[PDB]
Amino acid sequence: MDVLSKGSLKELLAHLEKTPLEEAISYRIGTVPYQNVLISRNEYYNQLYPDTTSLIDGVSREGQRNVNGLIMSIISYVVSGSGHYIPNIGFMLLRRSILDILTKHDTGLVTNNLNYGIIARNLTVSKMNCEQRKRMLICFKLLAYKDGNQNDYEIYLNQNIPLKQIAPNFIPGDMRTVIHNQDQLAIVGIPAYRLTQSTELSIRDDNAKSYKLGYVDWYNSNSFLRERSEFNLIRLKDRDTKYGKLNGW
Amino acid sequence: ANRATSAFLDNPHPVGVNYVDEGSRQFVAVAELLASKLIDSSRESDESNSDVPFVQAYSKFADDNPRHLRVKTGGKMANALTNVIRSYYSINAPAIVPQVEIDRLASKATVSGDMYNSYAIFNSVPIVEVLSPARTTVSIVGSDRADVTMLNTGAGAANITFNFGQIAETVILKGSVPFQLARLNQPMPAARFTYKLRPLDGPFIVVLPVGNPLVISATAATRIQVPLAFNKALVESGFQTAMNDGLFDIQNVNYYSSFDEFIISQYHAQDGINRVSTCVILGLALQAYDQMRRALPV
Amino acid sequence: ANRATSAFLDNPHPVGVNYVDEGSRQFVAVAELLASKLIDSSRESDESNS
Amino acid sequence: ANRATSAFLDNPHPVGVNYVDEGSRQFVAVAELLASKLIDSSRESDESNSDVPFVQAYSKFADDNPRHLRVKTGGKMANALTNVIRSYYSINAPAIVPQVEIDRLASKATVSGDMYNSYAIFNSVPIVEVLSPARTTVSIVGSDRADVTMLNTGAGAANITFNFGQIAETVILKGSVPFQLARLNQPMPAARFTYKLRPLDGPFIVVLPVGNPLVISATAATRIQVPLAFNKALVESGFQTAMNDGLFDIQNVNYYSSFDEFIISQYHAQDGINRVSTCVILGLALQAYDQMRRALPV
Amino acid sequence: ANRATSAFLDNPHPVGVNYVDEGSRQFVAVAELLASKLIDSSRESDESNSDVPFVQAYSKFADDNPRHLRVKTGGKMANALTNVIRSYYSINAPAIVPQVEIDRLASKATVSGDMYNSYAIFNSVPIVEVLSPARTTVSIVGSDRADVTMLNTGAGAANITFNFGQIAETVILKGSVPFQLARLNQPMPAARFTYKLRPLDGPFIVVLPVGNPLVISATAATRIQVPLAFNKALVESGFQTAMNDGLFDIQNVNYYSSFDEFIISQYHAQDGINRVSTCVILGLALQAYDQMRRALP
Amino acid sequence: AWVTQAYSSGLSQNSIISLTGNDRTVADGTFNSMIMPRAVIANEREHFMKTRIDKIEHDLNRSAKQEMMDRQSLAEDYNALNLAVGQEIKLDIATQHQLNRLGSAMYKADHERETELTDLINRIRENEVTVNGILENQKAITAAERADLLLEVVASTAKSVSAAGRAAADGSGVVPVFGPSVANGIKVGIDIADSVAEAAIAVKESGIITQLNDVYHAFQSVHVAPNDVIKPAAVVAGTSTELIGNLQAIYSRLRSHSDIGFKKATVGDVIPNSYMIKPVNSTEYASWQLYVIHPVQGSLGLVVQLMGDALTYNVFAQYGNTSASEFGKTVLTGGATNTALEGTKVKFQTKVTAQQALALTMALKDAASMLSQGELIGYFEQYINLALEPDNLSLQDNMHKYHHLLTSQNSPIDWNYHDEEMHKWLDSRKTTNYDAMQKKDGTVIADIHIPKVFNDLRNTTLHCKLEGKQTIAGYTVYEYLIGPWAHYGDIDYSVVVDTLNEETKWYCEVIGIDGHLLIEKSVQHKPEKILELTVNDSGVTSFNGRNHDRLKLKVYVKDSLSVKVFRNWIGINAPRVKTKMFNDHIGVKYDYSHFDKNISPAHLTLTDLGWHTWDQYNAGNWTNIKP
Amino acid sequence: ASWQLYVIHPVQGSLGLVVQLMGDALTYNVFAQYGNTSASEFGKTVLTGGATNTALE
């Protein structure tokens, strides 16, 4: 819910630096993806509504115990709000931040062999929306510059024209690019339209709506930080300053 | 020629490699300290006709107030303590405790997770192998006190080779009848009833006269570094409780009658020093589990 | 007529004859009391920051 | 003809290319200052019947207050220094310690980080090439003092060509019996016991008579820029301690008995003037490791 | 089968057994501390025009104020140090100085008597045994660096076994020409100039060709626990001074060229572990003796 | 999904290390991914192609055209043996000719393996002092390295122990029988409706029933080289005597199973074939594979189920399958295996015995968690379908220890009970089939399709074509090892020699522990009844006053084309002796060192013929009687 | 962290080759096939391309 509320490249990247990798993984076994299922949607129909389980739903699913599965779980957390079930990774990797896993060689993970075609295919990209695609392209760009595969990233974008049109423009090593970027990456927020407490047919839409109504409850709760009222109560380390920049950028 | 070995020294399964860091070791120590206070508070509350000492102890341990009509499991600490025990036993047991939960629980008390402050003596006897020539039968029974029964059917006196490993410090051998024992390439002394040997000295040769069977009773002592709070009596009871409770039901693992046999068997295995460090942490975890479960049965 | 005996009962060696007076007995009792306080204090320091 | 060469001049392995910048040089200088204060603090602690002088020194070095029942290891600075030493020896070392940690530890004290303030004299003698004709035997033994035993079994006198390199400053040649030595294509002088030569001058010719062996003992001096806090006695002690502790155990490397042999050998390679810079920083790191480890034994 | 051994490793004589208790250890530490202050004060008085720094340090050391007419000997502390050193070298030496005087002198200054809170590196290379075939000649010369010169005159190549003991931590071998060396029952590698060996591995086999003599230079490093006040330069200077001053001239003893040879030879005996405890204490006593003798006329 | 810290201890708790690390991912194109095992049954390309190579080997060594051309000669030779009524083999019958082709090829490979074991035992005994030195001194080294050391210290004549080396040095008579090639282009289904005419019987006699066709199409033979058996034998041996006992113990078991395999075709029932079940979806998140092994040369099957990373197995009896289920009762359990799983079924032929397949399954189950799924499948499918030992040395060592245990006297499976029971089941099945066919059609038709002559592989009177490569003074020597025997009774051996010369004299000698017989004959194109034997219950024979377990028969002939040795038991269905074990083989000892001695026919004289002992001859020159 | 070592003894040739692959570095040595009669299968190196270790385990 917190990750899905980030609306800018600065806020999203700042959140990924603070959060550790254990948030990306989940310890609930869940079910398996790519399975045709019959779910119950009684507000609309009496029969059982068919659908297909995927990795993009907000429910935890069993994942493969490899580097490919780890990256899919990280991107799933960013674009959906929940990750997968990959246990016994190791406390050394789980303490490090999501950004460090994505763009630092010191962690020890090897991601050079990863192919963006199957990752996009597995993390079903024909079913994503514009905001979800932009976040995935951010993760691909961060990984590509980590292993020096910028040329491969460009060729992949040139093959898929719609991805190129919405691809965010920022250099992973430069902080000026993050500041200048004005893409909207928010999947949840205060809605201008009328948001009701009703169900949606698809698994993806129902889970997304639950996060949206959950954010409204959290926005009006006591855990939210109203800057206009209590800006002098935050500590100096976490106060918003223009001089602030990501570590190593 | 025939060889025989102790039953409990065969095929030690790999132990878990999670929750062995500094913060995780502090969590087990915190659980041990707080589980002990739960036991003492129960005795004090019962003897002082007031339940207020128990409420404070349980609230600190479980992070919620004790209420009637509730099972009184122990809160998040009981769940975390139970799961870390399962991960310690086997390397295929999933580690499903978040690092945030470990740090949050470890901050309840100010303890040092140093697991090398003190030592403990373990009495399991590691008979690695006994080599016997033809027409001689050798049988090994027991782990706390090993009884080796040897019979010499052949015409001449035979030589039985004893190998006690290189980990144990002292092995005391007593026989039903006086017998002759000496190291390799050494004069055989007069027959005596008892022998004290250092396992690092080398393979030992025992002469076996033809006739009535000879039974040798072996008692060993080994020293392993343990934290100061370690208590062998509490660990043994907790080990039995965990096996009964089903914490060790993971597939493809070995089962042992006691923690003494478990810790020694892992020591007599490849990367024994690293294994023993994990087994010691499991021991302190099992001691906290025994105190807590006795205070709060489910 | 054969004879069998327990191994640990054969040939007990003589024990020491010094440090058996009352003054020595007090030393052992004092040492035990102070040793018990030592290990208890060591446990207390491990459970505290002092 | 035959060729003879010094044993320690064969195949100098490449050295590390990390932790050479100004920030890293500051960290090494900070470590040497703080490690030195540790030794004098302990001496002052013993003489003053109080552990307070040692407590303050260890708290600054280790960023952790010492405890009686807890082992003292040096903290992060001890780990960073150990990992830095490994990186310097070979280009194949992992070089795991980060740069943010290096900057934090460098801020503990104010030092120049100057690697070229002063100089030192190194006494290893490099004998690159000894050419001997047939029917003669030449053997070279020694690193601090090189003894060249040559025996002529021919009919007439033989000419032996010496080559001491172009790096050493002065070489003093002493013979068991008086001998004749001169330049290439230069007349011979009368027989003398001792010679002072500059290696840059050129290859030298020694006239070897027939019948009795001649042994030449050579001692050389070379000047290398080093920090002003350099101490040859401490560096050599640190070199042996690091070798025993296993910090130099890496595949495809050479091993040297003395630090003078190490620094001179790399100074004779093709890129020697760049290799010495890393060698000098490594020597000061070994100085800190010597003082730190003696005050805090493992 | 011929045998060759290092000269300094043969027949280590037993060391003294007195003055090893905690009270005596404090005496050596106190003597070293006060001797160091004495020489420092002597330097200060030479660089100034006042003898006040010297009279303060000498009075502390000798319990009597210095006088121009009387000679400066060091007092009872100097006498105690000399007799203590004599007893440490051999078991035959008398332990003349009593224990009441030792306890009194230890009370002059406050220092911990622990002699095992640090370590020192010693460079004496022990070659316990070199076994050679019949038709070969092997000579071992040197203590700090050992040169093993070997000549093979047989029909074929020979195998020579090296035994460096079980005490040395590491050994570095260098040869005049590249040579082959491998452990017992390992394959022989290619010819190399250098080798780094762990003596605990076991006997090492080298292959001697027939052609030309091969010389091997051996360096070793062993670690011995010492007090933090240990100084090898001061100890070695004290060893030469004690030998020249005739503190080691008693019947049925061995003589060594350095303190490195003395402590390594003792550590390689049957009772070596208990012997170095006395030898380390003697080393600190020599350091105090060197500093006191140099400062006093 | 796992990283390690630099400058850390390299030791790990587990003894078997996977090529793919704990992350369970290998970058393609790296060395680690190149040395990974390949799935042969699962991959359609490798399974399709492997069958092509095996077919080529069978066709190159045994040609269908050659076998059909030699049918007429073989029928005449088999008639020349005057056998009592009810015991003659009539090769004019189509069905009887088929079983002879399978029997002859199977027996020759088994016979050649026994010969190689005999020379190996001879070489081991010659170097007893140095063999015992290697076995005692080295024990921490791998079994493969120990096998290499043993084969080097002896004149093994085959030093290589690897699978590539074994295939490099292998005779033409060893290649396994490929069933589909034998049954190609052979008439099935002759319909003679209520016609007892002599012409109607002749055409029906020329065809086979469809049941025989299915049996051949699901038949493949297994023959284990002595070099592969040395690793299980030397893994725990402490002396040469123990090692020789293990080698003979294993080949006794392989002897019994090979005999059992042939009886399955003779009985008259369709033999089942091994198969693998894979999920329908190739890109499945949840992966499972099931292997059902039906060894034709054996009495116990194996079902291996790999569900995720968990391996379970079950050993089942191949007898007593009265119910509709193919599997009989299970004798050894290793978990729960579900044989009702739905998926694609792929048929394959195993090239390893039940013991070897079981040995690897136990080893994989021990290292279920240490190895990845690809490695578990690759190692198992390579061994089952290619007889290729795994590259993982630690895994290979564990397999051979289990292979020894299943063979030794402490085996969890008591093989003698199952092998005996399978024999009783097979003969009962044959009786039921014959009487069932006797009711449906005439008694003459029943004898045509299911013959009672053949029965067991060694009970059946078979011929063994010999190959000769050694010629001395123009006389080529042909070797044939008489014995050992799994049955007792009276047995006759005959020799047929055809050569280009119109007349010639050929000599046959029979070597025992004492001396040779030196028969001399001159007949051609007809068996000669060279030697006749009697066999005890224990399988031993009193040959010329000395108990023997095997003999060496050598035939010398000039300018020969083909030499065949025939064998026939006097009584039909000779009872079988108990299969020997480790204790039986080390209890008694015979010397085969005398089998390498050979004579020179060219320098022979009349007085030299007859039974002569070694003392009569001098040192060397075993042809001339004067010492 | 893998290393490969290849030793080629061409039966139809007068010289041999030893190729070693250590990481991203390739080193080779061409050796004479004659005169190696002293406890070694390699003669003198007629052409050197680096350092090759034949004692690898």
DSSP A45-110: -SSEEEEE--SSSSS-EE--SSHHHHHHHHHHHHHHS--EE-----HHHHHSBHHHHHH-GGG---
Neighbours of D198 (CB within 10 A): 12
* Long-range contacts of E189-192, Cβ-Cβ distance < 8 Å, separation of 24 or more: E189/G55, E190/G53, E190/G54, E190/G55
Neighbours of G52 (CB within 10 A): 22
Across the interface, whether the CB atoms of F28 and A62 are under 8 A apart is answered no
Alpha-carbon gap, residue A104 to A249, rounded angstroms: 12
Token pair belonging to E239: 């060893």
φ/ψ of residue D149, rounded to 5: -95, 115
HSE of B11, CA atoms in CB hemisphere, 13 A = 8
Angle between helices D75-89 and D99-106 (to 10 degrees): 120
Side-chain half-sphere of E79: how many Cα atoms within 13 Å?
Answer: 10
User: Residues F153, F178: contact at Cβ < 8 Å?
Assistant: no
CB-nearest partner of E112 from D39, D46, D139: D46
Residues 6+ apart with CB under 8 A from F188: F207, F208, F209, F210, F213
Is the backbone of residue C45 left (phi > 0), alpha (psi -120 to 50) or beta? alpha
Provide the H-helix boundaries in chain G.
Answer: none
The residue assigned the tokens 């069958």 is F51
Dihedral of the CA atoms A153, A158, A161, A162 (nearest 10)? 10
F108 CB-near residues (< 8 Å, 6+ apart): F173, F464, F465
Q: How many other CB atoms sit within 10 Å of the CB of residue E285?
A: 25
Give the number of other CB atoms < 10 A from CB of residue B135. Answer: 13
Contacts (Cβ under 8 Å, ≥6 apart) of F512: F543, F544, F546, F548, F551, F594
Among E36, E110, E118, E176, the strongest candidate for a mutation testing the D interface, having the largest count of D CBs within 10 A, is E176
Find all residues with CB under 8 Å of E164, minimum gap 6, and list them. Answer: E125, E126, E127, E128, E171, E197, E199, E204, E218, E220
| Nearest-neighbour CA in chain E from D49: distance (Å) | 6
Amino acid code (one letter) for D279:
C
A67's CB contacts (< 8 A; 6+ apart) are A109, A110, A111, A114, F1, F23, F25
Residue D226 has phi, psi (to 5 degrees) of -140, 165
Interface probe with D: pick from B114, B115, B118, most Cβ of D within 10 Å: B114
CA F506 to CA F609: how far, in whole Å? 13
Q: What is the DSSP letter of D34?
A: H
| Helix (H/G/I), strand (E/B), else coil: E207 | strand
Q: What are the φ and ψ backbone dihedral angles of F158, each rounded to 5 degrees?
A: -140, 90
**DSSP letter string, chain B:** -EEE--GGGS-PPPPP-SS-SHHHHHHHHHHHHHHHHHHHHHHHHHHTT-SHHHHHHHHHHHSS---TTS----HHHHHHHHHHHHHHH-SSS-----HHHHHHHHTTS-----S-SEEEEE------EEEE-TTEEEEEE-SSSEEEEEEE-SSS-EEEEEE--SS-SEEEEEEEEEE-EEETTS-----EEEEEE-GGG--EEEEE-SSS-EEEEEEEEEEEEE-TT--HHHHHHHHHHHHHHTTT--SS----SSHHHHHHHHHTSTTHHHHHHHHHHHHHHHHHHHHHHHHS--
Q: Which amino acid, residue D241?
A: T
- Chains C vs G: touching, with 3+ CB pairs under 8 Å? no
Burial class (CB in 10 A: 0-12, 13-18, 19+), F375: buried
**Cβ–Cβ below 8 Å for B275 and F238:** no
> How far is Cα D124 from Cα D220, in angstroms, rounded to an integer?
6
Q: How many other C-beta atoms can be found within 10 angstroms of the C-beta atom of residue F520? A: 15
- Calpha distance E1→D248 (Å, rounded): 37
CB G27 within 8 A of CB G51: yes
- Distances in Å between the Cα of F550 and the Cα atoms of F484, F503, F533 are 5, 32, 11
Q: How many helices (H) and strands (E) does chain A have?
A: 11, 4
SS3 assignment, position E136: strand
User: What is the three-state SS of B104-140?
Assistant: HHHCCCCCCCCCCCEEEEECCCCCCEEEECCCEEEEE
Closest-approach residue (CA) in chain F for A107: F3
Residue F313's DSSP bridge partners are: F304
d(Cα E78, Cα F165) in Å, to the nearest integer? 83
* Closest chain D residue by Cα to residue C49: D67
Q: In whole angstroms, give the CA distance from residue F121 to residue F553.
A: 18
| C-to-N gaps above 2.5 Å in chain F, after residues | none
Question: What is the distance between the alpha carbons of residues F221 and F202, in angstroms, rounded to a whole number?
Answer: 32
Q: What is the dihedral of CA D24, D25, D26, D31, to 10 degrees?
A: 90
Residues of C in contact with B175 (CB under 8 A): 7
Place of tokens 């027989």: D191
Determine the 3-state secondary structure of D218 from DSSP: strand
- Distance separating alpha carbons of residues E157 and E207, to the nearest angstrom: 7
d(CA D94, CA F7): 8
- Chain C and chain D share a number of CB contacts under 8 A equal to 5
Q: Are D208 and D160 in contact (CB under 8 A)?
A: yes
Helix or strand (DSSP H, E) at F554? strand F551-558
Residues paired with F428 in a beta bridge: none
Q: For strands F560-569 and F489-499, give the pairing.
A: antiparallel
Chain-chain contact of F23 with A66 (C-beta, under 8 angstroms): yes
The answer to whether the CB of F106 falls within 8 A of the CB of F177 is yes
Looking at chain A, which subunits does it touch, using at least 3 CB pairs closer than 8 Å as the criterion? B, F
How far apart (Å, rounded) are the C-alpha atoms in residues D165 and D172? Answer: 14
Sorted by sequence, the CB contacts under 8 Å of residue F462 that are 6+ apart come out as F100, F103, F104, F107, F566, F567
Cβ–Cβ below 8 Å for C42 and B175: no
How far apart are the two ends of chain E, measured CA to CA in Å? Answer: 56
H or E stretch at F520: strand F519-521
Is it true that the peptide bond before F484 is cis, omega within 30 degrees of 0?
A: yes
Q: Which residues pair with E220 in a beta bridge?
A: E171
Q: Which residue has the tokens 């009596």?
A: B233
What whole-number distance in Å separates Cα of residue G45 and Cα of residue G48?
7
Neighbours of B133 (CB within 10 A): 15
Q: How far apart are CA F487 and CA F612, in angstroms?
A: 29
CB contact under 8 A, E170 and D243: yes
SS3 F496: strand
Token pair belonging to B230 = 């370690």
Contact yes or no for E158/E152 (Cβ under 8 A): yes
Report the amino acid identity of residue F478: Y
Give the distance from CA D180 to its chain's centroid. Answer: 33
Closest residue by Cα to residue A68 from A117, A22, A105, A13: A117
Do D61 and D74 touch, CB atoms closer than 8 A? yes
Give the other-Cβ count within 10 Å of B248's Cβ: 19
Report how far Cα A154 is from the mean position of its chain's Cα atoms. 22
Query: Residue B219, Cβ neighbours under 10 Å: how many?
Result: 14
Contacts 24+ apart (CB under 8 A), A88-91: A88/B18, A88/B94, A88/B95, A88/F1, A88/F2, A89/A21, A89/A25, A89/F1, A89/F2, A90/B18, A90/F1, A90/F2, A90/F3, A91/B18, A91/B19, A91/B21, A91/B24, A91/B99
Method: cryo-EM
Contact at 8 Å (CB) between F116 and F481?
no
Backbone angles phi, psi at F416, to 5 degrees: -60, -40
**Type of residue at A68:** N
> What residues pair up with D206 in beta bridges, in sequence order?
D160, D181
Q: Which stretches does DSSP call E strand in F271-428?
A: 275-278, 288-293, 300-307, 310-317, 330-333, 344-347
Q: Name the token pair of D140.
A: 């070279």
Strand E170-183 with E204-208, pairing? antiparallel
Strands, DSSP E only, in D117-262? 118-122, 129-132, 136-141, 146-152, 158-163, 170-183, 192-197, 204-208, 214-226
Q: Residue B89 has which token pair?
A: 């036993």
Residues 6+ apart with CB under 8 A from E245: E293
Backbone region of residue A225 per phi and psi (left: phi > 0; alpha: psi in -120 to 50; beta: other values): beta
A36, β-bridge pairs: A52
* Residues in E touching G53 (Cβ below 8 Å): 190
- C-alpha to C-alpha distance for B25 and B112, rounded to whole angstroms: 8
Q: What is the dihedral of CA B235, B239, B245, B247, to 10 degrees?
A: 110
DSSP strands (E only) in chain E: 2-4, 118-122, 129-132, 136-141, 146-152, 158-163, 170-183, 192-197, 204-208, 214-226
Q: Which of B95, B98, B99 is opposite residue A88, by nearest beta carbon?
A: B95
Q: Which amino acid is at E200?
A: L
Does B21 touch chain A if contact means CB atoms closer than 8 Å? yes
Q: Collect all residues with Cβ–Cβ distance below 8 Å to A162 and sequence separation of at least 6.
A: none
To the nearest whole Å, the CA of D71 is away from the closest chain C CA by: 13
The alpha-carbon gap from B265 to the nearest alpha carbon of chain F, in Å, equals 13
Q: Cβ of F13 and B251 within 8 Å?
A: no
- Report residue D48 CA to chain centroid gap: 38
Query: Residue D257: beta bridge partners?
Result: none
| Largest Cα–Cα separation, chain A | 58
Q: How many residues does chain C have?
A: 50
How would you label F14-44 residue by residue, b for 16+ Cβ within 10 Å and e otherwise? Answer: bbbebbbbbbbbbeeeeeeeeebbebbbbee
Count of CA atoms in the C-beta half-sphere (13 A) of A237: 1
* Contact between D176 and D147 (Cβ < 8 Å): no
Q: Strand A61-62 and strand A84-85: pairing?
A: parallel
Q: How many CB pairs under 8 A join A and F?
A: 43
Resolution (A): 2.9
Q: Tokens 């006191």 map to which residue?
A: E292
Cα dihedral D24, D25, D31, D36, rounded to 10, equals 180
Burial of A232 (0-12, 13-18, 19+ CB in 10 A): exposed
- Which chain F residues touch G4 with a CB distance below 8 Å? 31
Task: Return the structure tokens found at F507.
Answer: 């000599």
Q: Which has the closest alpha carbon to F228: F400, F355, F357?
A: F400
Among B79, B92, B80, which residue's Cα sits nearest to residue B16? B92
